């Protein structure tokens, strides 16, 4: 007879209910299971009725794989899922958090902290739009973004993933969501999931909640704050996310007052689901349920019970799916987890899948492949990088000539520093590899290449990675541009109690600026100890992690555009002051939140 769930003209809620009523326990638990492409095979996907796949950081089909290679991979998995009895399409997720950043040749946008510097939500919406297109270029339908953490301590390894220490700025930047997913209809019910169709992707507000509030910025640790503080600082942007129809929410590894977020029924069910009326699906973080226990994974049976009873809908396993499925099945057969809980998880997963059009377009569109790295998107990334730059100093004394903007025509100029010609360094973490990497890892333009592309043909450009003082004094240079800063990092590898840049960095700046007027470009995920760099430099720019389009930097250095970025975080005098945020009783910054010098276009 007629099968209502397969009928594209029927309302989503009717299709969900029709399909849910047909499913076995195995088919239901399958929908709740998300696995790594690394453990996926056609038989695994078919036999376990798997609901979702992901690529973790650096999980790619081949080094340098084309958009088509990605589409073929995703479609191979989909074909297996579509061959099950009910033919429920899988959804494939990835960390597309500054562009489609795992993919070779994808446009890499500035990381979130630099976007916060722009104070430009429409720019961020446009970045969401371009990112959706590059993700769909690779056949992927689901991006684990935006990170709406409000980072309250820059010692956190993920501080660069947070738009600001100020929740109001994070709130405004939730415009990423309708960029990724499309604008919701007039009349939209807050908390319903939304994706416009096959040219958009499902978004994910993460990581719920207080991931940016942990003690001493220790990643995955305890956020110790009263309910009023949680609701005033860490929660607000989730409500903007509900209003904008975010499709999914990912749970944080962190704890709130000692309770694991992955086990917190009060917040996940009581608050997110029952108060905010969230109707999309709630996903774990990677091995998030394993980490409820200490040691992690020491009581996986408890991990499954605690997380599923808390209200999580989809588990990012991501590897040991057999153990997950077996344990969850046993809990349901034993009456420990009720069928109502399973039915709720599956209703939410199917709701997102039907809403986004996945049953109508389960396969990739080969005509989208050319969206990857498209020049228009690179032009956008270049605009964003330029807008993100914060000018901290432009002259050593109030009476010096301003150094910036620099002249494009000069006899001889010097470009120097470990970050001047290093694409990997300028992109930072979550670029190609999970932790990012060094050197030419993708298609882009380094600061050195941007300088050579910008200057008059008569300008001789000399590159020296780490010149000594005599080299500079003898070189006959008009000025120097020196780029230094942090190496790429992600998650706990970025936790850092000293916040001092690696050497050589300061030593290079001192050698260069001691011999010729210099503009220092600081590449970092966060404020770092900066007084010695300032003391040496004529001009200093905080460029954050500007991504693949290094011409964004030189657009401002050479005065094609004026500097406009403003600090989205407090710049501390000393790490012993931390945590120290705008509005604090004792607020003694080196530069306040909102500080930024300006220039005018030449
Ligand atoms: C402030 O605190 C931070 C965080 O705790 C700390 O930085 C970390 O230091 C660790 C050692 O103390 C280091 O762990 C080791 O890393 C070895 C390899 O490290 C290189 O490659 C990784 C990526 O694979 C980078 O992240 C590192 O920055 C480092 O990169 C190299 O750095 C040199 C010097 O600038 C450069 O010339 C190279 O080109 C560059 N290489 C690359 C590929 O980019 C590893 O093999 C060891 O087994 C060990 O695990 C850890 O990586 C680092 N984390 C970072 C930077 O995010 C600071 O202390 C050190 O800084 C490093 C760079 C080094 O110079 C140490 O001697 C410093 O003490 C702390 N600062 C202080 C205490 O003043
Ligand atoms: C030389 O540089 C000056 C400093 O940048 C610049 O004056 C600024 O111009 C900008 C852009 O027009 C002004 O921003 C606006 O401020 C409004 C009032 O609050 C906002 O409602 C606007 O939205 C806009 O704010 C920006 O929105 C985007 C976001 O990303 C930014 O962070 C945010 O600032 C800004 O207030 C001016 N600042 C000051 C101190 O005056 C000069 O531009 C002048 O000439 C033109 C371009 C015109 O816009 C004038 O109003 C402006 O004063 C610039 N001079 C020249 C000759 O180019
Ligand atoms: C926040 O971070 C702190 C610091 O990492 C966490 O405390 C640490 O927890 C680990 C257990 O995961 C402890 O390691 C264990 O130590 C015992 C010795 O007592 C040893 O026998 C075990 O094999 C294991 O290595 C570690 O000592 C401990 N450190 C401190 C200073 O307490 C803390 O649990 C984190 N909090 C949250 C909510 O995540
Ligand atoms: O080390 C590889 C894996 O580690 C995980 O903890 C990261 O979150 C994944 O993105 C990554 O694929
Ligand atoms: O790679 C999937 C997930 O891995 C986790 O380790 C990170 O915390 C998330 O930000 C990421 O989306």
In order, the DSSP letters of 48-91 are TT--EEEE-TT--SSTT--HHHHHHHHHHHHHHHHTSSS-PPPE
* Residue 484 host element (H or E): strand 480-485
Q: Distance from the CA of 252 to the center of ligand 5, in angstroms?
A: 9
Question: Measured in whole angstroms, how far is the alpha carbon of residue 108 from the centre of its chain?
Answer: 11
Q: Is 487 in the pocket of ligand 1 (CB under 6 A)?
A: yes
Check if 491 is active-site: yes
Question: Measured in whole angstroms, how far is the alpha carbon of residue 482 from the centre of its chain?
Answer: 27
- DSSP state for residue 208 in the 8-state scheme: E
Query: To one decimal place, what's the resolution in Å?
Result: 1.6
Q: Report the alpha-carbon distance of residue 478 to residue 460 in Å, rounded.
A: 10
Q: Report the alpha-carbon distance of residue 251 to residue 49 in Å, rounded.
A: 24
**Which two tokens mark 278?**
């969230």
If we measure between CA atoms, which residue out of 242, 275, 67, 23 comes closest to residue 148?
242
Domains of the chain and CATH, by start? 1-373 (3.20.20.300), 374-559 (3.40.50.1700)
Give 337-393 as a DSSP string. Answer: S-HHHHHHHHHHHHHHHHHTTTTT--S--GGGGGGTT-HHHHHHHHHHHHHH-EEEE
**Surface-to-core class of residue 268, CB atoms within 10 Å of its CB (0-12 exposed, 13-18 middle, 19+ buried):** buried
Instruction: Count CA atoms closer than 13 A to 384's CA, side-chain side.
Output: 33
- DSSP state for residue 10 in the 8-state scheme: S
Helix (H, G, I), strand (E, B) or coil at 486: coil
Q: Report the alpha-carbon distance of residue 208 to residue 269 in Å, rounded.
A: 12
Q: How far apart are the first and last CA of the chain?
A: 72
Helix (H, G, I), strand (E, B) or coil at 562: coil
Check if 576 is active-site: no
Q: Which residue's CA is the closest to the ligand 1 atom numbered 59?
A: 502
Q: Report the alpha-carbon distance of residue 593 to residue 561 in Å, rounded.
A: 23
Q: Is the peptide bond before 225 cis (omega within 30 degrees of 0)?
A: no
Asked if residue 537 lies in contact with residue 481, where contact means CB atoms within 8 angstroms, the answer is no
Q: Which residue's CA is the closest to the ligand 1 atom numbered 16?
A: 493
Which numbered atom of ligand 3 lies nearest the CA of 253? Answer: 39
Report the structure determination method: X-ray
Question: Locate tokens 């371009």: which residue?
Answer: 130
Q: Is the peptide bond before 504 cis (omega within 30 degrees of 0)?
A: yes
**Which two tokens mark 185?**
């209809």
If we measure between CA atoms, which residue out of 57, 10, 19 comes closest to residue 37?
57
Q: Report the alpha-carbon distance of residue 464 to residue 414 in Å, rounded.
A: 7
Q: Work out the angle between the directed axes of helices 300-310 and 339-355 (0-180°, nearest 10).
A: 70
* Residue 43 host element (H or E): helix 42-47
Q: Is the peptide bond before 318 cis (omega within 30 degrees of 0)?
A: yes
Q: Distance from the CA of 332 to the center of ligand 2, in angstroms?
A: 60
Q: Report the alpha-carbon distance of residue 8 to residue 295 in Å, rounded.
A: 47
Q: Which residues contact 244 (CB under 8 A, 6 or more apart)?
A: 174, 175, 177, 178, 181, 184, 194
Tell which phi-psi region holds residue 119, choosing left (phi > 0), alpha (psi between -120 and 50) or beta: left
Which one of 294, 295, 492, 495 would you pick to mutate in the ligand 3 pocket, going by the greatest count of ligand atoms within 8 A of its CB?
Answer: 294
Q: Which residues contact 454 (CB under 8 A, 6 or more apart)?
A: 408, 551, 554, 557, 558, 560
Asked if residue 557 lies in contact with residue 537, where contact means CB atoms within 8 angstroms, the answer is no
Q: Which residues contact 55 (CB under 8 A, 6 or more apart)?
A: 36, 37, 92, 93, 94, 95, 102, 140
Q: Work out the angle between the directed axes of helices 339-355 and 12-20 (0-180°, nearest 10).
A: 140
Q: Report the alpha-carbon distance of residue 176 to residue 180 in Å, rounded.
A: 6
Which numbered atom of ligand 3 lies nearest the CA of 255? Answer: 38
Which numbered atom of ligand 3 lies nearest the CA of 221? Answer: 39
Exposed e or buried b per residue across 568-589, where buried means at least 16 C-beta atoms within 10 angstroms of its C-beta: bbbbbeebeebbbbeeeeeeeb
**In the chain, which residues are last before a break of more than 2.5 Å from C to the next N?**
none
Nearest ligand atom owner, CA of 288:
5
Give 406-431 as a DSSP string. Answer: PPS--SEEEEESTTTT-HHHHH-SSB
Q: Which residue's CA is the closest to the ligand 5 atom numbered 4?
A: 286
Instruction: Count CA atoms closer than 13 A to 132's CA, side-chain side.
Output: 25
CB under 6 Å to ligand 2: residues?
118-120, 562, 564, 598, 600
75 φ, ψ (degrees, to nearest 5): -60, -35
252 φ, ψ (degrees, to nearest 5): -75, 145
Asked if residue 51 lies in contact with residue 31, where contact means CB atoms within 8 angstroms, the answer is yes
Across the beta sheet with 91-94, the strand order is: 142-143, 91-94, 52-55, 33-36, 315-316
Task: Output the furthest CA–CA distance in the chain (Å, rounded).
Answer: 87
67, 286, 413, 483 from 505: Cα distances, Å? 37, 35, 19, 8
Which numbered atom of ligand 3 lies nearest the CA of 260? Answer: 38
Q: Is the peptide bond before 336 cis (omega within 30 degrees of 0)?
A: no
């Amino acid at each position: 007879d007629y099968v209502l769930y397969k009928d594209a003209t029927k309302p989503v809620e009717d299709r969900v209910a029709d399909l849910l009523g047909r499913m076995t326990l195995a088919e239901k638990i399958g929908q709740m299971t998300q696995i790594e492409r690394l453990v996926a095979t056609p038989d695994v996907l078919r036999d376990n009725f798997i609901g979702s796949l992901l690529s973790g950081g650096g999980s790619v089909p081949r080094k340098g794989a084309t958009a088509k290679e990605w589409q073929d991979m995703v479609d191979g998995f989909q074909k297996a899922c579509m061959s099950t009895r009910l033919g429920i399409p899988m959804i494939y997720g990835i960390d597309a958090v500054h562009g489609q950043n795992n993919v070779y040749g994808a446009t890499i946008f500035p990381h979130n902290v630099g976007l916060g510097a722009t104070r430009d939500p429409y720019l961020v919406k446009r970045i969401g739009e371009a990112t959706a297109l590059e993700v769909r270029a690779t056949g992927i339908q689901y991006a684990f973004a935006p990170c709406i953490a409000v980072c309250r301590d820059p010692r956190w390894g993920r501080c660069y993933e947070s738009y600001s220490e100020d929740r109001r700025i994070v709130q405004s930047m939730t415009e990423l969501i309708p960029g990724l997913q499309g604008d919701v209809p007039k009349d939209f019910t807050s908390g319903m999931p939304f994706v416009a169709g096959k040219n958009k992707v499902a978004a994910c507000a993460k990581h719920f909640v207080g991931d940016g509030g942990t003690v001493d910025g220790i990643n995955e640790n305890n956020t110790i704050i009263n309910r009023e503080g949680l609701m005033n600082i860490h929660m607000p942007a989730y409500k903007n996310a509900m209003d904008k129809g975010v499709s999914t929410v990912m749970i944080s590894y962190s704890s709130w007052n000692g309770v694991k977020m992955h086990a917190n029924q009060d917040l996940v069910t009581g608050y997110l689901k029952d108060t905010l009326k969230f109707k999309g699906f709630v996903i774990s973080d990677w091995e998030g349920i394993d980490r409820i226990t200490t040691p992690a994974g020491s009581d996986y049976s408890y991990s499954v019970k605690a997380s599923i009873l808390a209200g999580l809908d989809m588990i990012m396993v991501p590897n040991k799916y057999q153990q997950f499925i077996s344990i969850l099945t046993g809990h349901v057969n034993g009456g420990v987890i009720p069928m109502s809980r399973i039915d709720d998880a599956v209703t939410r997963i199917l709701r997102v899948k039907f809403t986004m059009g996945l049953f109508e377009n389960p396969y990739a569109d080969p005509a989208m492949a050319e969206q990857l790295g498209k020049q228009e998107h690179r032009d956008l990334a270049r605009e964003a990088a330029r807008k993100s730059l914060v000018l901290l100093k432009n002259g050593k004394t109030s009476t010096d000539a301003p150094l910036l903007p620099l002249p494009k025509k000069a006899p001889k100029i010097l470009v120097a520093g470990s970050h001047a010609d290093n694409l990997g360094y300028q992109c930072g973490g979550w670029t190609i590899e999970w932790q990012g990497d060094t050197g030419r890892t993708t298609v882009g333009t380094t600061i050195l290449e941007a300088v050579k592309a910008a200057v008059d043909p008569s300008t001789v450009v000399v590159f020296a990675e780490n010149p000594d003082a005599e080299f500079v004094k003898s070189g006959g240079f008009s000025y120097a541009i020196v780029a230094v800063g942090e190496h790429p990092y992600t998650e706990t590898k970025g936790d850092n109690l000293n916040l001092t840049i690696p050497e050589p960095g300061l030593s290079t700046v001192q050698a260069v600026c001691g011999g010729v007027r210099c503009a220092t470009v600081l590449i970092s995920g966060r404020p770092v100890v900066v007084q010695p760099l300032l003391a040496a430099s004529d001009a200093l720019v905080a460029a954050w992690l500007p991504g693949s389009e290094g011409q964004g930097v030189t657009d401002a250095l050479f005065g094609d555009f004026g500097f406009t970025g403003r600090l989205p975080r407090t710049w501390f005098k000393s790490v012993d002051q931390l945590p120290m945020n705008v509005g604090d009783a004792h607020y003694d910054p080196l530069f306040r939140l909102g500080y930024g010098l300006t220039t005018n276009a030449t």
